[PDB]
Amino acid sequence: ITGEEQGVAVATGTQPSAPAMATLATAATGTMPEEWKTFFSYY
Amino acid sequence: PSAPAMATLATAATGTMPEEWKTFFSYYTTVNWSTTDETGKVLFVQGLSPRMNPFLDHLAKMYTGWSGSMEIRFTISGSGVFGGKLAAVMVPPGIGTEGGTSLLQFPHVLVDARQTEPVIFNIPDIRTVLWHDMHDTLTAHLVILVYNDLLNPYQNTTTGTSCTVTVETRGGTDFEFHLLKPPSRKMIFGADPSRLIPKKSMFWEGNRLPGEFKGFSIKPLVFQANRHFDCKRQTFGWSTPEHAGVKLNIQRQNLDTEDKTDIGVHLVTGLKTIKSQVPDGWPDYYGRNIILANTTASFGEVSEAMLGTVVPYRVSGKLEWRHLPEIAFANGTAKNSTIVCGKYLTGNFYVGGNFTQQGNVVVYPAFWTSKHGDTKCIGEDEDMVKRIDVLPQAQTTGGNYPIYYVTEFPAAYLPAPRVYNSQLLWTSRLLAQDVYDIGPEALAVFKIKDSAGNWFDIGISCEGFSFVGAPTLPFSSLQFPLEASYVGMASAYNKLQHNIA
Amino acid sequence: PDITGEEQGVAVATGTQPSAPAMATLATAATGTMPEEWKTFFSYYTTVNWSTTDETGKVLFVQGLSPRMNPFLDHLAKMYTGWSGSMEIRFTISGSGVFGGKLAAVMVPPGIGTEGGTSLLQFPHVLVDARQTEPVIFNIPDIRTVLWHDMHDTLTAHLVILVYNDLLNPYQTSCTVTVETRGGTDFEFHLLKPPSRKMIFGADPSRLIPKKSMFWEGNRLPGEFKGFSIKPLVFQANRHFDCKRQTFGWSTPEHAGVKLNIQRQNLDTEDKTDIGVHLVTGLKTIKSQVPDGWPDYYGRNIILANTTASFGEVSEAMLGTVVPYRVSGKLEWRHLPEIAFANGTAKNSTIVCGKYLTGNFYVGGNFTQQGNVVVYPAFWTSKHGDTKCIGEDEDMVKRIDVLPQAQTTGGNYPIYYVTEFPAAYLPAPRVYNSQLLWTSRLLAQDVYDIGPEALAVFKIKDSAGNWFDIGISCEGFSFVGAPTLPFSSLQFPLEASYVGMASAYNKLQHNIA
Amino acid sequence: PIYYVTEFPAAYLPAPRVYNSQLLWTSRLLAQDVYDIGPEALAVFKIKDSAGN
């Protein structure tokens, strides 16, 4: 069966951490996703 | 007198839907997947060109442009036992297929070696312009890489085991030719390069010397001037392509050796010229510094002669000539029964033969003397090819190698005697009278069939040299009844494919 | 499941799919297209000449309905096996308003005979004046007996352009008429094939005469083609091949020399005054002991004398230039001279040559070694009093067997193709040929359907619009339908089109200024 | 560990060669700036020959 690009594949893990640590990091530094398209830059 | 009725009855009898070449898939190639093909190895590269599907191949000759996508139908026909994974990568237009392993960092679909159904790929039609032109190569590519090697559990036959991948093509739902053109009409910047290689081997003459085709040779380098014509009508040789032989005016012994011991040398006049001073049909390959000493009668003492057969021309009378025997060709004034000069067609042209009468005559290159030690086809040597002012050439063009066509010519010591030919005679007659589509960065590709599934692409460049993918393919394995079949315009920098036992 | 259909397979999307419909619409707008463009407009087909000398009822243009009538349909036809429907004819006369005459197009139904004569005016004709100053548009209905037509059907409808009123010319010239064709609304191809899948059975007569004069080599001696000649009787033994692959000759179509072997013996002629002679053994033979490729024409009674100086012989046998066959050493041969060919018995120094190639074979030449050689027939002459082209004389045409021969046949005169050969004091040297070389290669490799009383008629066309019909008989001989016509006028770069199967003993057609 | 091998002429030594701790460029850099490679870390560069080895 043809396997997709995006990944048709199976997920696996063992004893993982949380995703709230991602929120912790996002708090640490307020990095909105696509910033560079927001502010001019000297030329 | 007529009726629609009659047309209705014919549709009943025969079932034709009025444009049904767009519905089915048609054969394109078969690519061998070996149990010895290393990861990343490129199985299959093919840029979007209408020229694939035979039917669009036909219809294209009648159109100036094209658009839309096309479909590729793979049939992976392995056993249920074989393990293996085949990668499919679409290359954004203009990015090269340089090296397999890398490409894999594109987005890519995986195709398993044990698939029960064929796979249909729609090569996208990414374009910057509203409609393409019949020669445009800056198109999206499809690359089929090997991702995990073809595992066969069985190794009792230890090596050389294989699987078969057959390719079929169709117009996409949206493929549509654009501008109607008469068949046979030359497009601006070139004629249709389809008519370059005859269809059948039977018709294959070499451009160097007349003979029956006997196979192909591969070299790292390639070089020929005479009767070699580029895609764009330029030609650095000196001859019209007709193998008519070279017909000359014979001057008497006025500059023949005066202290001779052997058959004399006679300065001649070309009478027809393409290039100044050069007789039309001067044999291109012969030894430098030839010695005509000891040339009593036999000529077999000469090292690299190009002996020619002789016959009279527009004599209009009693044949006052003597018994015209054979000629040795030469070039370069000498102080004795020798011919010193070489490397260039600057010097005066001379004729080795027992001639006494002044007049005009035809001579054909007819036999090759050689040194007793020859193991080399006529034209192996740069040093012996003859230049006017420039030798064209080709070397490995992005992993693609130049080929010489090989043909028989009678040639003294050499067992199985051969001459190397740059261009097929056909390809030469054309490309003389017409300009051809082969772009500066192009490679017009042909497909050479014999039997047993043997095939190998030959491609023609701008310069008009024949190219091949790999450098050592066993030509020895082929069957004579070769057949050519145009393919398309492949990007010069790609690798040409090859599939032979 | 296991079964796989003509159009099936998993659909897979890779990478960037760029919204096909929008771009397709953009392109469609960029260049409008109808379902079949080649049916909306008229395409140049053929021009035919019209001379003041043309009596009433002279046929100008004969064209049985086919796809070949139009360029685009002609090219498409490669992809199909069958056709149906009508074709629209647009024809024009161009001429000075001073000229006067009328021309009548009639759509001849299949069963009618397409010859001239005033009776052909008497069924629905459309007529054009030399002053009309407008194309006239008339339709060719597709009358059939069979539900659809094959690609070679000879039962098709016919178009004849007659001279109605002669072409008067106040001053004292040839006008020109052009034909433009168009697919009808009803035209429709049928069973679909790949091109490169050659026509039916590989027995197709269309593969006989090459489409361009660039390839028209002759079957008697090598060289580039110079037109045709008419004769009351036409004959040749060698390289002549019948419908049935029967050949009374002694040669394969190869036309690449004679593969012979020389015996050292000088045959003890006069030590002077002649080059002596060697007997010959052929390395190869298609028939009886006959070496492959002796010249079919040369003088009997070859008096070799004084020949030591040069080949000044009368009534020549072919002089031929010589090569060593192949060797493993340096070169065993010496100073190979020009050969002169001969057959029969060496009764004397001179070789007694018969009309028949039954005797031993001999060559005049200063040989002394033994070895294999190849010789090419390369020069000829006769006595100064002669002007006859090579192959004209019955007697000099050499025979093993029955000498095939074509008589003036049912209003048709057999023809020789003429090509040039190197020869001297024979003004404009020519050699006569029963066949083209392509019609010798073929007819060797394949059997054909050429009927016992049927001819395969080909339309050979000048540039200047002239045309005439050449038909290949079961015997392989070419025929045309006049005792004499001005081939002198013929422009050298001809083309041929296959016209179909026509009964032998019906006259052939011709239209030359 | 590895030696970058290069050729400069010598006597009596077939296939003359020299051993090198660092490419010239890998030395030019590491002079001009403080690259952040750690005490127990390796900056890994993948070397692909033509043909894929």
Residues ≥6 apart with Cβ < 8 Å to B43: B31, B33, B37, B86, B144, B145, B146, B165
Q: Which value, to the nearest 10 degrees, does the dihedral of the CA atoms of residues D19, D22, D28, D29 take?
A: 180
DSSP state of B17: -
Distance from CA of B101 to the nearest CA of D (A): 7
Minimum CA–CA partner of D52 in chain B: B101
B122 part of contact set with chain A, CB < 8 Å: no
C192 part of contact set with chain A, CB < 8 Å: no
- Distance from C-alpha of C85 to C-alpha of C140, rounded to nearest angstrom: 9
Residues ≥6 apart with Cβ < 8 Å to B356: B252, B253, B322
CA C21 to chain centre: 52
Handedness of CA C199, C205, C206, C209 (dihedral sign): positive
Identify which of A1, A2, A5 has the shortest CB distance to residue B107: A5
C10 part of contact set with chain A, CB < 8 Å: yes
CB contact under 8 A, B119 and A2: yes
Q: Are C444 and C436 in contact (CB under 8 A)?
A: no
Residues ≥6 apart with Cβ < 8 Å to C28: B176
Identify which of B109, B112, B115 has the shortest CB distance to residue A5: B109
Distance from CA of D10 to the nearest CA of B (A): 32
Q: Do D and C touch (≥3 CB pairs < 8 Å)? A: no
The count of CB pairs under 8 A between chains A and C is: 3
Tell me the Cα Rg of chain D. 15
Nearest to C59 by CA among C168, C176, C159: C159
Distance from CA of B77 to the nearest CA of C (A): 12
Distance from CA of B23 to the nearest CA of A (A): 24
- Distance from C-alpha of C231 to C-alpha of C489, rounded to nearest angstrom: 18
A4 part of contact set with chain B, CB < 8 Å: yes
Longest dimension (CA), chain C: 95
Q: Which value, to the nearest 10 degrees, does the dihedral of the CA atoms of residues C268, C348, B311, C337 take?
A: -10
- In total, chain C counts a number of residues equal to 513
Helix (H) or strand (E) holding B31: strand B26-34
B63 part of contact set with chain C, CB < 8 Å: no
Contacts of B111 in chain A (CB under 8 A): 2-3
B372 part of contact set with chain C, CB < 8 Å: yes
Q: Are B465 and B431 in contact (CB under 8 A)?
A: no
Collapsed DSSP state (helix, strand, coil) of residue C30 = helix
Identify which of A1, A4, A5 has the shortest CB distance to residue B112: A1
Minimum CA–CA partner of D51 in chain B: B99
- Distance from C-alpha of B494 to C-alpha of C305, rounded to nearest angstrom: 69
CB contact under 8 A, A2 and C10: yes
Q: Which two tokens stand for residue B145?
A: 């890489």
The count of CB pairs under 8 A between chains B and D is: 11
Nearest to C362 by CA among C472, C269, C475: C269
In which residue are the tokens 């192996």 written? B380
CA A18 to chain centre: 14
- Distance from C-alpha of B197 to C-alpha of B449, rounded to nearest angstrom: 13
CB contact under 8 A, C17 and B122: yes
Collapsed DSSP state (helix, strand, coil) of residue B14 = helix
CB contact under 8 A, B412 and C327: yes
- Distance from C-alpha of B394 to C-alpha of B219, rounded to nearest angstrom: 10
Resolution in A: 3.7
Q: Are B229 and B431 in contact (CB under 8 A)?
A: yes
Q: Are C13 and B107 in contact (CB under 8 A)?
A: no
Q: Residue C202: what are its φ and ψ, rounded to 5°?
A: 55, 25
Which CA distances in Å does B310 have to B210, B301, B350, D18? 16, 20, 14, 65
Q: Which two tokens stand for residue C241?
A: 């091949």
The half-sphere exposure of C300 on its side-chain side, counting CA atoms within 13 A, is: 13
- Distance from C-alpha of C240 to C-alpha of C250, rounded to nearest angstrom: 9
Q: Which residues of C465-483 are buried (b: 16+ CB within 10 A; e: fewer)?
A: bbbbbbbbbbbbbbbbbbe
Q: Are C156 and C66 in contact (CB under 8 A)?
A: yes
- Distance from C-alpha of B152 to C-alpha of B161, rounded to nearest angstrom: 8
- Distance from C-alpha of C435 to C-alpha of C415, rounded to nearest angstrom: 9
Residues ≥6 apart with Cβ < 8 Å to B198: B204, B424, B426, B484
Contacts of D48 in chain B (CB under 8 A): 99, 101-102
Distance from CA of A8 to the nearest CA of B (A): 10
- Distance from C-alpha of B283 to C-alpha of B286, rounded to nearest angstrom: 7
CA B482 to chain centre: 13
Which CA distances in Å does C235 have to C291, C397, C402? 21, 8, 11
Collapsed DSSP state (helix, strand, coil) of residue C248 = coil
Q: Is C251 exposed, middle or buried (0-12, 13-18, 19+ CB in 10 A)?
A: buried
Residue C326 sits at the vertex; the CA angle it makes with C321 and C332, to the nearest 5 degrees, is 85
Minimum CA–CA partner of B103 in chain D: D52
Handedness of CA B406, B407, B408, B411 (dihedral sign): negative
- Distance from C-alpha of C302 to C-alpha of C305, rounded to nearest angstrom: 9
